[PDB]
Write an enzyme that holds these catalytic residues in place. Structure first.
Site, PDB file in Angstrom:
ATOM      1  N   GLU A   1       0.859  -1.197   0.000  1.00  0.00           N
ATOM      2  CA  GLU A   1       0.000   0.000   0.000  1.00  0.00           C
ATOM      3  C   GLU A   1       0.900   1.253   0.000  1.00  0.00           C
ATOM      4  OE1 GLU A   1      -2.989   0.356  -0.685  1.00  0.00           O
ATOM      5  OE2 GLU A   1      -3.921  -1.606  -0.271  1.00  0.00           O
TER       6      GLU A   1
ATOM      7  N   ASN B   1      -7.214   9.540  -6.067  1.00  0.00           N
ATOM      8  CA  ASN B   1      -7.953   8.605  -6.947  1.00  0.00           C
ATOM      9  C   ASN B   1      -8.687   9.436  -8.007  1.00  0.00           C
ATOM     10  OD1 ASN B   1      -7.242   6.188  -5.446  1.00  0.00           O
ATOM     11  ND2 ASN B   1      -8.434   7.112  -3.823  1.00  0.00           N
TER      12      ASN B   1
ATOM     13  N   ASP C   1     -11.675   9.342  -8.805  1.00  0.00           N
ATOM     14  CA  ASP C   1     -12.998   9.699  -8.220  1.00  0.00           C
ATOM     15  C   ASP C   1     -12.909  10.935  -7.296  1.00  0.00           C
ATOM     16  OD1 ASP C   1     -12.166   8.906  -5.761  1.00  0.00           O
ATOM     17  OD2 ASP C   1     -13.643   7.309  -5.466  1.00  0.00           O
TER      18      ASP C   1
ATOM     19  N   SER D   1     -11.436  11.206  -4.300  1.00  0.00           N
ATOM     20  CA  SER D   1     -10.991  10.720  -2.967  1.00  0.00           C
ATOM     21  C   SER D   1      -9.463  10.607  -2.945  1.00  0.00           C
ATOM     22  CB  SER D   1     -11.670   9.427  -2.589  1.00  0.00           C
ATOM     23  OG  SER D   1     -11.201   8.300  -3.332  1.00  0.00           O
TER      24      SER D   1
ATOM     25  N   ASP E   1      -6.182   8.382  -0.773  1.00  0.00           N
ATOM     26  CA  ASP E   1      -5.774   7.306   0.165  1.00  0.00           C
ATOM     27  C   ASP E   1      -4.620   7.809   1.036  1.00  0.00           C
ATOM     28  OD1 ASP E   1      -7.467   5.398  -1.202  1.00  0.00           O
ATOM     29  OD2 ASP E   1      -5.878   4.930  -2.575  1.00  0.00           O
TER      30      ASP E   1
ATOM     31  N   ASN F   1      -8.984   5.319   2.636  1.00  0.00           N
ATOM     32  CA  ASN F   1      -9.638   6.170   1.627  1.00  0.00           C
ATOM     33  C   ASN F   1     -10.614   7.172   2.266  1.00  0.00           C
ATOM     34  OD1 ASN F   1     -11.978   6.465  -0.525  1.00  0.00           O
ATOM     35  ND2 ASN F   1      -9.995   6.364  -1.565  1.00  0.00           N
TER      36      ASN F   1
ATOM     37  N   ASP G   1     -15.886  -4.804   8.984  1.00  0.00           N
ATOM     38  CA  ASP G   1     -17.179  -4.299   8.431  1.00  0.00           C
ATOM     39  C   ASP G   1     -17.855  -5.355   7.556  1.00  0.00           C
ATOM     40  OD1 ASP G   1     -19.068  -1.980   8.419  1.00  0.00           O
ATOM     41  OD2 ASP G   1     -18.792  -2.127   6.219  1.00  0.00           O
TER      42      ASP G   1
END
Ligand SMILES: [Cl-]
Ligand SMILES: [Cl-]
Ligand code: NA
Ligand SMILES: [Rh+]
EC number: 3.2.1.17
Length: 129
Positions: free
Chosen positions: A35, A46, A48, A50, A52, A59, A101
């Site tokens: 990562e 990203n 989109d 967002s 990280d 994120n 989650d």
């Protein structure tokens, strides 16, 4: 901070990741290598909108607030900047919410594609724990 492999293994163990939700320590060290290259200050924008953040590339669409991810949640209730600290506490506590989650460590694309089903023990070889 750029952690050494065993340095990060020891800190992750101190902060309770060894066997957390049944994931051995080596899974977490392998995920952090791919990562962030063990760099707590790693960021990736990203397409989109967002970003990280930190050693586990958490994120801003779901997990932290950076003030610039429109329509996003903040499920770890932290500023994204907390995830870049030399102190891995905020990263580890958020990582515990993520992995709990429903999709487990599959939430980390680098873990899914590079660590999952591999000999993850290798990542903690030679470390005092
Ligand atoms: Cl960065
Ligand atoms: Cl935002
Ligand atoms: Na957010
Ligand atoms: Rh610590």
């Amino acid at each position: 901070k750029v952690f050494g492999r065993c340095e990060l293994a020891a800190a992750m163990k101190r902060h309770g990741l060894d066997n957390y939700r049944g994931y051995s320590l080596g899974n977490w060290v392998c995920a952090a290598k791919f990562e962030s290259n063990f760099n707590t200050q790693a960021t990736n924008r990203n397409t989109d909108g967002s970003t990280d953040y930190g050693i586990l590339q958490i994120n801003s669409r779901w997990w932290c607030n950076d003030g610039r991810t429109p329509g996003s949640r903040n499920l770890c209730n932290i500023p994204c900047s907390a995830l870049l600290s030399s102190d891995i506490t905020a990263s580890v506590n958020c990582a515990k919410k993520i992995v709990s989650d429903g999709n487990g460590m599959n939430a980390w694309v680098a873990w899914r594609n590079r660590c999952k089903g591999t000999d993850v023990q290798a990542w903690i070889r030679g470390c005092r724990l």
